[PDB]
Amino acid sequence: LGHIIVTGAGSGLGRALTIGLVERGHQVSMMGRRYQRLQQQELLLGNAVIGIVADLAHHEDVDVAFAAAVEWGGLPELVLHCAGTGVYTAEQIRRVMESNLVSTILVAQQTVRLIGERGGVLANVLSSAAQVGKANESLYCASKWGMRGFLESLRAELKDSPLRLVNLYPSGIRSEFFMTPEDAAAYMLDALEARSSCHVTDLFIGRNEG
Amino acid sequence: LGHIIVTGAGSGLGRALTIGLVERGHQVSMMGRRYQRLQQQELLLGNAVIGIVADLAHHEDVDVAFAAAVEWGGLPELVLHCAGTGEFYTAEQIRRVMESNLVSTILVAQQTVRLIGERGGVLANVLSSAAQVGKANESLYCASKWGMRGFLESLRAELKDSPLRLVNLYPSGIRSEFFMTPEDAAAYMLDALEARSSCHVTDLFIGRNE
């Protein structure tokens, strides 16, 4: 009955979050760039979800994807935005930030439009991939700080509006070959549980010691 | 699961945190200054708790408190420090509560590093902002809250290569001198303190529902 939208649903993180919300009885509109991963999730979870293929970095593409989501599940209670992640060149830089900041901005504006008056939750994942040496670090910092700048500025603007902004920070998730998606998701979904007198506004998760 | 130490155990929040932990199966050493509250809670929770009277700003109370705690329940797996204070400036009087906050924070922290620094476990600190309804002494609380945060973030970075983990919890808008309930706040904090294999929550920010 409870409709949730999850972007980057094909990521290890987005997969785990989608699975977890389903297990907690929610319907989930999965948005992702990679259709094969959306289908594999549809095969696993069936009528509890739909895969909407969308590239969230273009204003029209966002409009279309959200229209199908609302079409299938009605207005959402939670928009879970998983921006994911990724000697630098311009062409290397544009791509990264446009998949990240642009998607973040467009999903947020589309969410304000859709549920700004009705209320609900806009949850953003500013994930931090575990590097073994910190090679490309400064571009990731640029990326995540920009997103945080935008969102905390948007949340202060949405003071007194029924729409709540929640920012979630899993630091140390895997890619290219120690925080598991499952554990990350479980903290995040517990944190996103509704309670009468309060909610979690910010959640920082870090890796365990060896 | 294991033995926990709760400071400020008779405050609304400290009490809810204790009740929540005892319900989760833990044995709880309950530290605080309000001896009847502790006595009441001992009668309410029976064998699962012990009431330890301590002014945690006084080194001697601190040593005696932890000796008694460890002697009753063994080394803690978790020390949960609720400094928790608000006023309603002068130098001579008002430094009392403001300094009891920091000093108790520094002392509990230091006792915790000593007892469980090598073994490992969790030092969890509660940095509350009460729902003042007036705004009157706000710069004083900021000073206190930021003092504590600065000490703790410095201690945390200092402890990077050690199994003792430092967790900071920020319930911003609790009931006060007598919107956010202690019960909802505790529930969020104890979920976030739940242990998992690959990661743990480092910082939790809880905010009022509008």
Side-chain angles (χ1 to χ4, degrees):
Chain A
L1 178 87
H3 188 212
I4 314 288
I5 289 174
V6 178
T7 62
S11 62
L13 214 136
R15 258 196 31 123
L17 289 159
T18 298
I19 300 175
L21 292 153
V22 165
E23 290 180 350
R24 294 154 191 248
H26 287 101
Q27 303 278 82
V28 181
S29 285
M30 308 179 303
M31 298 180 186
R33 252 251 86 169
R34 284 172 288 179
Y35 83 93
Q36 285 174 337
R37 286 160 179 249
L38 291 165
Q39 290 185 142
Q40 115 199 171
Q41 291 290 98
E42 282 192 282
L43 207 131
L44 181 76
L45 308 166
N47 59 154
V49 297
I50 26 137
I52 298 147
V53 178
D55 195 17
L56 296 174
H58 279 80
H59 187 242
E60 45 274 308
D61 303 45
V62 173
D63 288 320
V64 173
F66 271 86
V70 166
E71 172 183 13
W72 171 91
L75 299 181
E77 307 176 332
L78 165 64
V79 179
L80 231 189
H81 186 248
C82 294
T85 16
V87 199
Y88 315 55
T89 57
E91 331 289 36
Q92 236 92 193
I93 296 155
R94 321 150 80 270
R95 73 176 103 251
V96 170
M97 81 178 28
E98 284 194 36
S99 116
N100 296 8
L101 180 49
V102 174
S103 78
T104 297
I105 290 176
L106 294 162
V107 168
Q109 291 171 176
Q110 186 77 210
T111 305
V112 174
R113 169 189 98 76
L114 267 174
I115 59 165
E117 297 215 49
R118 187 177 153 267
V121 181
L122 171 65
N124 270 277
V125 183
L126 297 72
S127 59
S128 220
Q131 240 68 285
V132 279
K134 301 98 72 202
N136 277 160
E137 164 130 48
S138 72
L139 169 55
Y140 283 96
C141 288
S143 191
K144 63 182 140 237
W145 282 103
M147 287 182 281
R148 187 172 185 165
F150 171 76
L151 298 167
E152 290 185 1
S153 167
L154 181 55
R155 64 143 56 122
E157 174 191 325
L158 296 176
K159 255 225 274 79
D160 305 302
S161 164
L163 179 53
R164 284 161 193 170
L165 270 57
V166 179
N167 294 332
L168 313 160
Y169 304 78
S171 276
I173 207 88
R174 31 174 38 104
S175 190
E176 177 59 35
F177 36 75
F178 221 124
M179 176 183 309
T180 73
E182 291 68 34
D183 289 344
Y187 281 125
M188 294 172 79
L189 299 175
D190 286 3
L192 289 168
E193 286 278 311
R195 306 199 191 272
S196 305
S197 63
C198 58
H199 62 296
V200 161
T201 55
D202 315 86
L203 181 70
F204 295 79
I205 309 158
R207 287 204 317 277
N208 285 351
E209 223 266 280
Chain B
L1 210 50
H3 174 225
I4 313 278
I5 288 173
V6 178
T7 293
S11 66
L13 186 55
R15 176 194 151 187
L17 277 171
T18 311
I19 290 161
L21 256 0
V22 165
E23 282 191 12
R24 286 152 130 101
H26 301 288
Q27 287 296 105
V28 180
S29 288
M30 299 183 299
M31 298 185 186
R33 295 209 57 165
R34 293 166 241 212
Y35 70 98
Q36 316 109 321
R37 261 148 204 233
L38 300 178
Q39 285 182 160
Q40 288 161 17
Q41 284 163 226
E42 282 190 306
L43 286 163
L44 180 84
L45 303 178
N47 275 337
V49 292
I50 195 189
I52 294 161
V53 192
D55 178 5
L56 292 174
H58 286 109
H59 215 241
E60 243 213 74
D61 280 29
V62 178
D63 305 341
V64 166
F66 281 79
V70 169
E71 286 165 19
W72 174 80
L75 300 184
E77 92 163 15
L78 158 62
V79 176
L80 226 177
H81 180 250
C82 306
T85 325
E87 201 276 316
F88 108 87
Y89 305 127
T90 61
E92 14 144 313
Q93 260 116 26
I94 312 235
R95 76 164 78 91
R96 84 298 229 64
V97 158
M98 247 172 43
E99 299 331 326
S100 88
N101 286 326
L102 224 120
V103 170
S104 74
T105 290
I106 286 173
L107 301 184
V108 177
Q110 287 184 338
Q111 192 73 229
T112 307
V113 171
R114 179 191 75 96
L115 274 158
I116 69 166
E118 259 86 289
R119 167 186 157 83
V122 172
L123 177 63
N125 276 278
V126 178
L127 289 68
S128 271
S129 310
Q132 52 194 356
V133 125
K135 211 98 160 205
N137 299 138
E138 217 261 309
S139 58
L140 215 68
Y141 311 144
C142 282
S144 173
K145 183 200 196 174
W146 277 107
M148 285 181 279
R149 187 165 181 174
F151 163 75
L152 289 166
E153 291 193 4
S154 175
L155 180 62
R156 173 152 72 186
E158 164 188 324
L159 291 175
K160 233 213 153 299
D161 295 328
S162 77
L164 175 58
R165 312 200 261 250
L166 262 54
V167 183
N168 290 340
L169 310 168
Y170 299 81
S172 212
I174 229 128
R175 303 235 142 257
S176 90
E177 102 241 284
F178 279 108
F179 260 107
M180 176 185 311
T181 77
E183 291 91 3
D184 290 342
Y188 278 130
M189 297 167 77
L190 294 189
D191 282 355
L193 294 172
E194 295 274 319
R196 317 202 101 99
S197 306
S198 84
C199 59
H200 68 286
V201 176
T202 63
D203 313 275
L204 182 73
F205 292 81
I206 307 159
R208 272 158 79 253
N209 286 352
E210 102 284 300

PDB file of all heavy atoms in Angstrom, chain A residues 120-144:
ATOM      1  N   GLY A 120       5.516  14.292   3.071  1.00  0.00           N
ATOM      2  CA  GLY A 120       6.271  13.077   2.783  1.00  0.00           C
ATOM      3  C   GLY A 120       7.764  13.277   2.965  1.00  0.00           C
ATOM      4  O   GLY A 120       8.194  14.248   3.585  1.00  0.00           O
ATOM      5  N   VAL A 121       8.558  12.348   2.425  1.00  0.00           N
ATOM      6  CA  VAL A 121      10.007  12.316   2.662  1.00  0.00           C
ATOM      7  C   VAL A 121      10.840  12.287   1.364  1.00  0.00           C
ATOM      8  O   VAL A 121      10.568  11.496   0.452  1.00  0.00           O
ATOM      9  CB  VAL A 121      10.384  11.152   3.631  1.00  0.00           C
ATOM     10  CG1 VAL A 121      11.878  11.105   3.925  1.00  0.00           C
ATOM     11  CG2 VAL A 121       9.617  11.299   4.959  1.00  0.00           C
ATOM     12  N   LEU A 122      11.821  13.197   1.291  1.00  0.00           N
ATOM     13  CA  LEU A 122      12.845  13.200   0.250  1.00  0.00           C
ATOM     14  C   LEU A 122      14.165  12.817   0.883  1.00  0.00           C
ATOM     15  O   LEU A 122      14.793  13.616   1.606  1.00  0.00           O
ATOM     16  CB  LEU A 122      13.003  14.561  -0.449  1.00  0.00           C
ATOM     17  CG  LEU A 122      14.217  14.680  -1.390  1.00  0.00           C
ATOM     18  CD1 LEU A 122      14.112  13.754  -2.579  1.00  0.00           C
ATOM     19  CD2 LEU A 122      14.462  16.132  -1.866  1.00  0.00           C
ATOM     20  N   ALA A 123      14.584  11.593   0.600  1.00  0.00           N
ATOM     21  CA  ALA A 123      15.783  11.062   1.227  1.00  0.00           C
ATOM     22  C   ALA A 123      16.828  10.955   0.161  1.00  0.00           C
ATOM     23  O   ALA A 123      16.571  10.405  -0.902  1.00  0.00           O
ATOM     24  CB  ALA A 123      15.511   9.718   1.869  1.00  0.00           C
ATOM     25  N   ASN A 124      17.996  11.517   0.446  1.00  0.00           N
ATOM     26  CA  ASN A 124      19.101  11.500  -0.487  1.00  0.00           C
ATOM     27  C   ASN A 124      20.274  10.710   0.075  1.00  0.00           C
ATOM     28  O   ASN A 124      20.633  10.868   1.252  1.00  0.00           O
ATOM     29  CB  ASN A 124      19.541  12.911  -0.813  1.00  0.00           C
ATOM     30  CG  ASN A 124      18.820  13.481  -1.994  1.00  0.00           C
ATOM     31  OD1 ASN A 124      19.174  13.240  -3.139  1.00  0.00           O
ATOM     32  ND2 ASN A 124      17.805  14.265  -1.722  1.00  0.00           N
ATOM     33  N   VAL A 125      20.853   9.868  -0.774  1.00  0.00           N
ATOM     34  CA  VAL A 125      22.034   9.091  -0.420  1.00  0.00           C
ATOM     35  C   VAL A 125      23.267   9.772  -1.015  1.00  0.00           C
ATOM     36  O   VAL A 125      23.394   9.901  -2.229  1.00  0.00           O
ATOM     37  CB  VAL A 125      21.959   7.625  -0.915  1.00  0.00           C
ATOM     38  CG1 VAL A 125      23.190   6.833  -0.445  1.00  0.00           C
ATOM     39  CG2 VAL A 125      20.723   6.961  -0.384  1.00  0.00           C
ATOM     40  N   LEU A 126      24.138  10.260  -0.141  1.00  0.00           N
ATOM     41  CA  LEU A 126      25.417  10.798  -0.557  1.00  0.00           C
ATOM     42  C   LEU A 126      26.511   9.747  -0.239  1.00  0.00           C
ATOM     43  O   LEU A 126      27.289   9.890   0.696  1.00  0.00           O
ATOM     44  CB  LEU A 126      25.658  12.167   0.106  1.00  0.00           C
ATOM     45  CG  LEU A 126      24.689  13.328  -0.225  1.00  0.00           C
ATOM     46  CD1 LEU A 126      23.297  13.170   0.414  1.00  0.00           C
ATOM     47  CD2 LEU A 126      25.287  14.638   0.230  1.00  0.00           C
ATOM     48  N   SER A 127      26.535   8.666  -1.015  1.00  0.00           N
ATOM     49  CA  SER A 127      27.395   7.515  -0.700  1.00  0.00           C
ATOM     50  C   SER A 127      28.875   7.776  -0.993  1.00  0.00           C
ATOM     51  O   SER A 127      29.219   8.628  -1.820  1.00  0.00           O
ATOM     52  CB  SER A 127      26.903   6.251  -1.406  1.00  0.00           C
ATOM     53  OG  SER A 127      26.876   6.426  -2.813  1.00  0.00           O
ATOM     54  N   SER A 128      29.744   7.053  -0.293  1.00  0.00           N
ATOM     55  CA  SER A 128      31.175   7.319  -0.345  1.00  0.00           C
ATOM     56  C   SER A 128      31.950   6.020  -0.540  1.00  0.00           C
ATOM     57  O   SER A 128      32.322   5.349   0.427  1.00  0.00           O
ATOM     58  CB  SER A 128      31.620   8.039   0.930  1.00  0.00           C
ATOM     59  OG  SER A 128      32.569   9.047   0.647  1.00  0.00           O
ATOM     60  N   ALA A 129      32.183   5.684  -1.809  1.00  0.00           N
ATOM     61  CA  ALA A 129      32.859   4.446  -2.222  1.00  0.00           C
ATOM     62  C   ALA A 129      34.239   4.259  -1.597  1.00  0.00           C
ATOM     63  O   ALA A 129      35.077   5.166  -1.629  1.00  0.00           O
ATOM     64  CB  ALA A 129      32.955   4.388  -3.739  1.00  0.00           C
ATOM     65  N   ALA A 130      34.460   3.075  -1.029  1.00  0.00           N
ATOM     66  CA  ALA A 130      35.737   2.727  -0.402  1.00  0.00           C
ATOM     67  C   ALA A 130      36.905   2.625  -1.399  1.00  0.00           C
ATOM     68  O   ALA A 130      37.023   1.649  -2.148  1.00  0.00           O
ATOM     69  CB  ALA A 130      35.600   1.432   0.409  1.00  0.00           C
ATOM     70  N   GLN A 131      37.753   3.652  -1.402  1.00  0.00           N
ATOM     71  CA  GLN A 131      38.989   3.653  -2.182  1.00  0.00           C
ATOM     72  C   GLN A 131      40.134   3.076  -1.358  1.00  0.00           C
ATOM     73  O   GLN A 131      40.199   3.287  -0.142  1.00  0.00           O
ATOM     74  CB  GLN A 131      39.345   5.070  -2.645  1.00  0.00           C
ATOM     75  CG  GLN A 131      39.422   5.257  -4.160  1.00  0.00           C
ATOM     76  CD  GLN A 131      38.075   5.146  -4.854  1.00  0.00           C
ATOM     77  OE1 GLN A 131      37.532   4.053  -5.016  1.00  0.00           O
ATOM     78  NE2 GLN A 131      37.540   6.282  -5.288  1.00  0.00           N
ATOM     79  N   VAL A 132      41.026   2.346  -2.024  1.00  0.00           N
ATOM     80  CA  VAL A 132      42.207   1.787  -1.368  1.00  0.00           C
ATOM     81  C   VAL A 132      43.459   2.600  -1.728  1.00  0.00           C
ATOM     82  O   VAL A 132      44.314   2.156  -2.501  1.00  0.00           O
ATOM     83  CB  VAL A 132      42.382   0.257  -1.660  1.00  0.00           C
ATOM     84  CG1 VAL A 132      41.479  -0.575  -0.745  1.00  0.00           C
ATOM     85  CG2 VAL A 132      42.112  -0.068  -3.134  1.00  0.00           C
ATOM     86  N   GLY A 133      43.545   3.806  -1.168  1.00  0.00           N
ATOM     87  CA  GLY A 133      44.657   4.717  -1.447  1.00  0.00           C
ATOM     88  C   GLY A 133      44.244   6.166  -1.656  1.00  0.00           C
ATOM     89  O   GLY A 133      45.092   7.065  -1.621  1.00  0.00           O
ATOM     90  N   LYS A 134      42.943   6.381  -1.870  1.00  0.00           N
ATOM     91  CA  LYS A 134      42.341   7.709  -2.090  1.00  0.00           C
ATOM     92  C   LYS A 134      42.849   8.414  -3.360  1.00  0.00           C
ATOM     93  O   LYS A 134      43.326   9.552  -3.307  1.00  0.00           O
ATOM     94  CB  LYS A 134      42.494   8.615  -0.853  1.00  0.00           C
ATOM     95  CG  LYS A 134      41.862   8.075   0.441  1.00  0.00           C
ATOM     96  CD  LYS A 134      42.889   7.386   1.342  1.00  0.00           C
ATOM     97  CE  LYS A 134      43.836   8.389   1.990  1.00  0.00           C
ATOM     98  NZ  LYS A 134      45.110   7.743   2.415  1.00  0.00           N
ATOM     99  N   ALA A 135      42.711   7.733  -4.499  1.00  0.00           N
ATOM    100  CA  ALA A 135      43.257   8.196  -5.780  1.00  0.00           C
ATOM    101  C   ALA A 135      42.501   9.369  -6.434  1.00  0.00           C
ATOM    102  O   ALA A 135      43.115  10.387  -6.785  1.00  0.00           O
ATOM    103  CB  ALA A 135      43.379   7.019  -6.757  1.00  0.00           C
ATOM    104  N   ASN A 136      41.188   9.213  -6.613  1.00  0.00           N
ATOM    105  CA  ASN A 136      40.345  10.228  -7.263  1.00  0.00           C
ATOM    106  C   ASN A 136      39.549  11.065  -6.255  1.00  0.00           C
ATOM    107  O   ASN A 136      38.464  11.563  -6.570  1.00  0.00           O
ATOM    108  CB  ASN A 136      39.361   9.565  -8.242  1.00  0.00           C
ATOM    109  CG  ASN A 136      39.974   9.263  -9.607  1.00  0.00           C
ATOM    110  OD1 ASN A 136      39.451   8.433 -10.355  1.00  0.00           O
ATOM    111  ND2 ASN A 136      41.066   9.940  -9.944  1.00  0.00           N
ATOM    112  N   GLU A 137      40.095  11.224  -5.052  1.00  0.00           N
ATOM    113  CA  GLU A 137      39.321  11.713  -3.906  1.00  0.00           C
ATOM    114  C   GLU A 137      38.681  13.102  -4.057  1.00  0.00           C
ATOM    115  O   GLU A 137      37.527  13.291  -3.679  1.00  0.00           O
ATOM    116  CB  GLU A 137      40.151  11.637  -2.621  1.00  0.00           C
ATOM    117  CG  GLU A 137      39.583  12.466  -1.484  1.00  0.00           C
ATOM    118  CD  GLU A 137      39.452  11.695  -0.192  1.00  0.00           C
ATOM    119  OE1 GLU A 137      40.436  11.023   0.205  1.00  0.00           O
ATOM    120  OE2 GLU A 137      38.360  11.756   0.420  1.00  0.00           O
ATOM    121  N   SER A 138      39.422  14.056  -4.610  1.00  0.00           N
ATOM    122  CA  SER A 138      38.974  15.451  -4.647  1.00  0.00           C
ATOM    123  C   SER A 138      37.750  15.692  -5.539  1.00  0.00           C
ATOM    124  O   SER A 138      36.974  16.615  -5.291  1.00  0.00           O
ATOM    125  CB  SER A 138      40.125  16.382  -5.039  1.00  0.00           C
ATOM    126  OG  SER A 138      40.446  16.226  -6.407  1.00  0.00           O
ATOM    127  N   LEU A 139      37.585  14.872  -6.576  1.00  0.00           N
ATOM    128  CA  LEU A 139      36.410  14.989  -7.432  1.00  0.00           C
ATOM    129  C   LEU A 139      35.169  14.432  -6.733  1.00  0.00           C
ATOM    130  O   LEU A 139      34.080  14.986  -6.876  1.00  0.00           O
ATOM    131  CB  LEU A 139      36.637  14.352  -8.815  1.00  0.00           C
ATOM    132  CG  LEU A 139      35.445  14.132  -9.771  1.00  0.00           C
ATOM    133  CD1 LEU A 139      34.617  15.405 -10.088  1.00  0.00           C
ATOM    134  CD2 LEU A 139      35.915  13.468 -11.064  1.00  0.00           C
ATOM    135  N   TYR A 140      35.344  13.370  -5.947  1.00  0.00           N
ATOM    136  CA  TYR A 140      34.246  12.821  -5.150  1.00  0.00           C
ATOM    137  C   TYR A 140      33.804  13.820  -4.093  1.00  0.00           C
ATOM    138  O   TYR A 140      32.608  13.960  -3.842  1.00  0.00           O
ATOM    139  CB  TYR A 140      34.624  11.493  -4.476  1.00  0.00           C
ATOM    140  CG  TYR A 140      34.610  10.302  -5.402  1.00  0.00           C
ATOM    141  CD1 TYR A 140      35.782   9.863  -6.013  1.00  0.00           C
ATOM    142  CD2 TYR A 140      33.426   9.600  -5.663  1.00  0.00           C
ATOM    143  CE1 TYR A 140      35.786   8.766  -6.874  1.00  0.00           C
ATOM    144  CE2 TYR A 140      33.420   8.493  -6.523  1.00  0.00           C
ATOM    145  CZ  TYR A 140      34.606   8.086  -7.124  1.00  0.00           C
ATOM    146  OH  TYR A 140      34.621   7.001  -7.976  1.00  0.00           O
ATOM    147  N   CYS A 141      34.773  14.500  -3.480  1.00  0.00           N
ATOM    148  CA  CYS A 141      34.463  15.532  -2.493  1.00  0.00           C
ATOM    149  C   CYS A 141      33.716  16.670  -3.135  1.00  0.00           C
ATOM    150  O   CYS A 141      32.663  17.051  -2.639  1.00  0.00           O
ATOM    151  CB  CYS A 141      35.709  16.044  -1.791  1.00  0.00           C
ATOM    152  SG  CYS A 141      36.363  14.835  -0.666  1.00  0.00           S
ATOM    153  N   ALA A 142      34.238  17.182  -4.250  1.00  0.00           N
ATOM    154  CA  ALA A 142      33.505  18.165  -5.038  1.00  0.00           C
ATOM    155  C   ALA A 142      32.058  17.703  -5.219  1.00  0.00           C
ATOM    156  O   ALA A 142      31.129  18.415  -4.855  1.00  0.00           O
ATOM    157  CB  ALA A 142      34.159  18.384  -6.375  1.00  0.00           C
ATOM    158  N   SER A 143      31.887  16.493  -5.742  1.00  0.00           N
ATOM    159  CA  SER A 143      30.568  15.954  -6.047  1.00  0.00           C
ATOM    160  C   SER A 143      29.624  15.930  -4.852  1.00  0.00           C
ATOM    161  O   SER A 143      28.517  16.477  -4.928  1.00  0.00           O
ATOM    162  CB  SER A 143      30.684  14.554  -6.655  1.00  0.00           C
ATOM    163  OG  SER A 143      29.444  14.129  -7.188  1.00  0.00           O
ATOM    164  N   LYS A 144      30.051  15.298  -3.759  1.00  0.00           N
ATOM    165  CA  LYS A 144      29.205  15.167  -2.580  1.00  0.00           C
ATOM    166  C   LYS A 144      28.950  16.495  -1.858  1.00  0.00           C
ATOM    167  O   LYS A 144      27.820  16.742  -1.443  1.00  0.00           O
ATOM    168  CB  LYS A 144      29.715  14.086  -1.609  1.00  0.00           C
ATOM    169  CG  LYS A 144      31.078  14.326  -1.001  1.00  0.00           C
ATOM    170  CD  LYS A 144      31.475  13.166  -0.098  1.00  0.00           C
ATOM    171  CE  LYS A 144      32.961  12.837  -0.283  1.00  0.00           C
ATOM    172  NZ  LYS A 144      33.176  11.399  -0.701  1.00  0.00           N
TER     173      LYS A 144
END
